[PDB]
C-alpha cells in the first residue's frame, strides 16, 4: 500500500507549493494518476489475499472500497472548484488539503490489518469531515449538523473502543487474520450480549441504522458538495465494512442478536423511502434515499449468508457512485438558483437537455434498473432475505414500489412540466459539470460489464 | 386567459355561464347536428320564459334550481376542444415554448447563424430598456387612493410611451412555437 | 359588458407591438448562415455495409468462438419418422403397422 499512500501524501506539498493558477490543474491530474495506481490491487490471480506487511493488506472487500476512495478524490476536486472560486488562495489550498486528508485516512482505514489501527483511522476521519461541513457549509444549521455528526459517531465509538481493548486483553492481539483463524464459539451470556452490542453499535450508527439516522439528513443538507460526496459514497461504508470485519468473532450470538436490527432496517427502509415522497428539499430527499438503501446493507450483513454478503458488497459500491452522482446533479441547479427546494426549478429538460439525460440515468440507477449493479446487489439481498424468512419479500416489495415512485417523482418534478421561466440565470451547463456526471456514470456502466470485481469475499 | 376575473360574478354573468355550459353538454348528448339544433332551441325557450323576472330573489332561486338540475343531467364525459383545459392537446407544446431570454446565452458561433435576427433583437432590447422607467412611473401615478385594486393595467396615455408591463405579453412564445 | 375604453386602448397598443414582434421573428433569405448513383444501388450499398459486413463478423464469432465451446449452441433433436434414413449411420427406420384404413 505504500506505493499508493506515499504519492497521496505528496499531494499535500504539491497543493501548498503550487502556484495559485496551477493548484487545481496539478492536484486533480495527479489525483487521477493515483486512482490509476490503485488498480494494481485488482491483479488477483489466486485465492490468497494480499498481505503487504504486518500493517497493510487488501482483499476483495477492501480493494473495491480503496479504489472507489481513490476515484472520488479527483471527482470531489472538480465538484468544489466553482463554489470556492471566491475564496482566497490559502483558503482554497486548505480545502484541498482536507480532501486529500480524507483520501489518505480512508485508504489506510480500508487496508489496516489490526482493529485498533482501524479504529484510530476510523475516528481520525471525523476531523477533516467536521471541518469541511462547518467551515464551508452555507447555512447557520451547519454548526448543529457538525455536532450531531460528531457525537452520534463518538457515543457509539467509545463502546467500540472498550470492546476492542477487551478482545485484545483476552486474545492477545487485534490482528484480523489471527482473529479469524483462532476464533472460538462465544457463550450466550448477558456479558457477551453487551459485548456484541459494543462491537456493533458504532458501525450501525455510521450506516446509519434506522432510529439513529437523524445525523445524516442534517449533515447532507448543510455540507458542501464535496462533503456530501464523500459522506454518502465512502463514509457510510465504514460501518458496513466494519460490521463485516468484526462479525467473524461474534458467533453464534448474531443468530439472535441481529433480530432487532433486521427489524429496524426492514421496517425502517419503508419509513425512510416513504419520507422521500413528501420531502421538499432535494438534498434531504437524496439523503433519506441513502438511509433506505443502507438499511438493506444492514439486513444482509446481519443474516451472514454468502449471497447476502455479495449483494451487500455490490450495493455498497453501486450506491456509492449513484448517490454521489445525485448530489452532484442537485448541486448544479443549486449553484444557479441557490435553493435546495425541489419544487422551485421545473421543466429543466427544456434548457439543460444533456444534464437531464444524466438526471435520468442517475434516477434509473437509483431505482435499480437491470442489469445495473444497483439491481444486482438489491436482487441478491432480496434472495438471501427470502431464504431467511419468506415474509421479508412483503417489505421488500413495498420498498421497491416506493423507490420507483420517488425516483421518478424527482425527475418529473425538476426536469419536466413547464419551465419556471422567471429563472433567467439558468446558465448553460459547464463542461466541468457534464464531465463530472460522466465520471460517475461510466464506472457504473463498466462495473455492470464486469461485476466479478465487486462481489466481495464470499463469491 | 387575457382578462383577469373580477372580485365576484354579477347575477347576469352566472346565468350566461350556465347557458353556455347547458348548451355544450346538450351538444354532447345529442351528437347529431339536427337533433342538437332542435333541443338547443328548446333550451333557449326555457331561459327566455324567465328572462324578465324582476323579483331578483326569485331569479336567484331560479338560478339555484337550474344549477342543481344541470348537475343531475350533466354529461359524464362532455366534449372538450382539443386545446382547452382537459383536452387531448392541452399543454402539448409547452415543452417547445422556450422563453426569449434563453438567447442571451447563445454562443457567438450560434448567433452568427442569424445575423439579421439578432440585430432586430437588439432594437427590441433597447426599446425595452428606455421605456421601463416611464412605465414604472405611470403605474405609480395611476394608483387609486382607496385601496380597492384590480389586475387591469392602464394603457399608454402620452406619445412615445408603451403600455406598462408589456414585455411578457408582447414577446411571449407562439402557440405553435416550432 | 364589452371592453372599457381603457381596455380597448391597451389591447390596441399591445396588438401593434405584438404583431411587430411576430413579424420580426421571420428569417431573412440568407438566414440561417450555414458554413459550407441510381435507386436500388442505394439498396445494394446499404446491404453490403449493414448486412454483409456485420454478417462476416457475426459468423466469425459464432463459428470460431461459440461452436468451439461445449453446450453453447444446443438444438433439439430433429424429428425421425418411420421410413427415414439416418445419414450419420445409414440405418433405415422400420415402417409402421397397418391400422387398417378408414373412410370419412
Amino acid at each position: 500500500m505504500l506505493k499508493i499512500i506515499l504519492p497521496s501524501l505528496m499531494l499535500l506539498p504539491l497543493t501548498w507549493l503550487s502556484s495559485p493558477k496551477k493548484t487545481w490543474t496539478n492536484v486533480t491530474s495527479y489525483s487521477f494518476l493515483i486512482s490509476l495506481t490503485s488498480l494494481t490491487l485488482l491483479w488477483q490471480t489466486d485465492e490468497n489475499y494480499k498481505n503487504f506487511s504486518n500493517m497493510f493488506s487488501s482483499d476483495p472487500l477492501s480493494t473495491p472500497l480503496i479504489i472507489l476512495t481513490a476515484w472520488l478524490l479527483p471527482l470531489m476536486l472538480m465538484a468544489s472548484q466553482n463554489h470556492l472560486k471566491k475564496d482566497n488562495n490559502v483558503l482554497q489550498k486548505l480545502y484541498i488539503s482536507m480532501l486529500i486528508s480524507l483520501q489518505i485516512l480512508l485508504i489506510m482505514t480500508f487496508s489496516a490489518t489490526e482493529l485498533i489501527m482501524f479504529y484510530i483511522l476510523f475516528e481520525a476521519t471525523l476531523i477533516p469531515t467536521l471541518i469541511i461541513i462547518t467551515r464551508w457549509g452555507n447555512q447557520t444549521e451547519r454548526l448543529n449538523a457538525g455536532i450531531y455528526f460528531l457525537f452520534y459517531t463518538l457515543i457509539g465509538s467509545i463502546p467500540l473502543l472498550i470492546a476492542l481493548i477487551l478482545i485484545q486483553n483476552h486474545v492477545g492481539t487485534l490482528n484480523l487474520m489471527i482473529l479469524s483463524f483462532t476464533t472460538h464459539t462465544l457463550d450466550a451470556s448477558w456479558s457477551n450480549n453487551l459485548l456484541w452490542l459494543a462491537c456493533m453499535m458504532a458501525f450501525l450508527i455510521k450506516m446509519p441504522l434506522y432510529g439513529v439516522h437523524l445525523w445524516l439528513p442534517k449533515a447532507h443538507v448543510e455540507a458542501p458538495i464535496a462533503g456530501s460526496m464523500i459522506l454518502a459514497a465512502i463514509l457510510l461504508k465504514l460501518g458496513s465494512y466494519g460490521m463485516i470485519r468484526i462479525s467473524i468473532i461474534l458467533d453464534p450470538l448474531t443468530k439472535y442478536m441481529a433480530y432487532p436490527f433486521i427489524l429496524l432496517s426492514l421496517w425502517g427502509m419503508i419509513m425512510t423511502s416513504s419520507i422521500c415522497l413528501r420531502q421538499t428539499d432535494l438534498k434531504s430527499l437524496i439523503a433519506y434515499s441513502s438511509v433506505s438503501h443502507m438499511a438493506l446493507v444492514i439486513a444482509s450483513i446481519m443474516i451472514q449468508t454468502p449471497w447476502s454478503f455479495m449483494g451487500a458488497t455490490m450495493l455498497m459500491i453501486a450506491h456509492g457512485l449513484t448517490s454521489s452522482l445525485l448530489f452532484c446533479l442537485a448541486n448544479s441547479n443549486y449553484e444557479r438558483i441557490h435553493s435546495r427546494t425541489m419544487i422551485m426549478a421545473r421543466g429543466l429538460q427544456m434548457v439543460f437537455p444533456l444534464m437531464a439525460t444524466w438526471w435520468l440515468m442517475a434516477s434509473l440507477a437509483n431505482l435499480a434498473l437491470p442489469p445495473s449493479i444497483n439491481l444486482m446487489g438489491e436482487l441478491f439481498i432480496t434472495m438471501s432475505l427470502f431464504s431467511w424468512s419468506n415474509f421479508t419479500i412483503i417489505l421488500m416489495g413495498i420498498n421497491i414500489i416506493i423507490t420507483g415512485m420517488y425516483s421518478m417523482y424527482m425527475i418529473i418534478t425538476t426536469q419536466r412540466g413547464k419551465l419556471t421561466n422567471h429563472m433567467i440565470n439558468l446558465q448553460p451547463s459547464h463542461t466541468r459539470e457534464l464531465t463530472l456526471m460522466a465520471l460517475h456514470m461510466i464506472p457504473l456502466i463498466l462495473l455492470t460489464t464486469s461485476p466479478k470485481l465487486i462481489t466481495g469475499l464470499t463469491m | 386567459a387575457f382578462c383577469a376575473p373580477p372580485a365576484y360574478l354579477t347575477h347576469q354573468q352566472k346565468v350566461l355561464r350556465l347557458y353556455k355550459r347547458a348548451l355544450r353538454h346538450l351538444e354532447s348528448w345529442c351528437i347529431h347536428r339536427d337533433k342538437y339544433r332542435y333541443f338547443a332551441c328548446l333550451m333557449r325557450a326555457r331561459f327566455e320564459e324567465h328572462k324578465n323576472e324582476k323579483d331578483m330573489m326569485r331569479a336567484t332561486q331560479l338560478l339555484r334550481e337550474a344549477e342543481e338540475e344541470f348537475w343531475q343531467n350533466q354529461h359524464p364525459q362532455p366534449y372538450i376542444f382539443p386545446d382547452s383545459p382537459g383536452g387531448t392537446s392541452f399543454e402539448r407544446y409547452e415543452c417547445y415554448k422556450v422563453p426569449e431570454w434563453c438567447l442571451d446565452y447563445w454562443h457567438p458561433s450560434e448567433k452568427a447563424m442569424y445575423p439579421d435576427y439578432f440585430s432586430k433583437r437588439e432594437q427590441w432590447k433597447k426599446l425595452r430598456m428606455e421605456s421601463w422607467d416611464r412605465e414604472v412611473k405611470q403605474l405609480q401615478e395611476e394608483t387609486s387612493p382607496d385601496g380597492i385594486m384590480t389586475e387591469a393595467l392602464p394603457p399608454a396615455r402620452r406619445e412615445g410611451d408603451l403600455p406598462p408591463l408589456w414585455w411578457h405579453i408582447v414577446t411571449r412564445p407562439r402557440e405553435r412555437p416550432t | 359588458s364589452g371592453y372599457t375604453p381603457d381596455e380597448k386602448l391597451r389591447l390596441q397598443q399591445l396588438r401593434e407591438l405584438r404583431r411587430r414582434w411576430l413579424k420580426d421573428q421571420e428569417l431573412s433569405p440568407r438566414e440561417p448562415v450555414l458554413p459550407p448513383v441510381f435507386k436500388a444501388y442505394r439498396s445494394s450499398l446499404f446491404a453490403v455495409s449493414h448486412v454483409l459486413i456485420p454478417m462476416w463478423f457475426v459468423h466469425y464469432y459464432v463459428k470460431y468462438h461459440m461452436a468451439t465451446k461445449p453446450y453453447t449452441i444446443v438444438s433439439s433433436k430433429p424429428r425421425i419418422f418411420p421410413g427415414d434414413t439416418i445419414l450419420e449411420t445409414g440405418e433405415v427406420i422400420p415402417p409402421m403397422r397397418d391400422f387398417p384404413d378408414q373412410h370419412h
Binding site: P428 | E100, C102, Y105, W106, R174, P177 | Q25, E26
Partner: peptide, 13 residues
C-alpha cells in the same frame, strides 16, 4: 412560405 426563428436554449455547450 415564411420561415420563422425557433427559439432554443444554447446547445453549443
Amino acid at each position: 412560405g415564411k420561415r420563422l426563428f425557433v427559439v432554443k436554449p444554447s446547445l453549443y455547450y
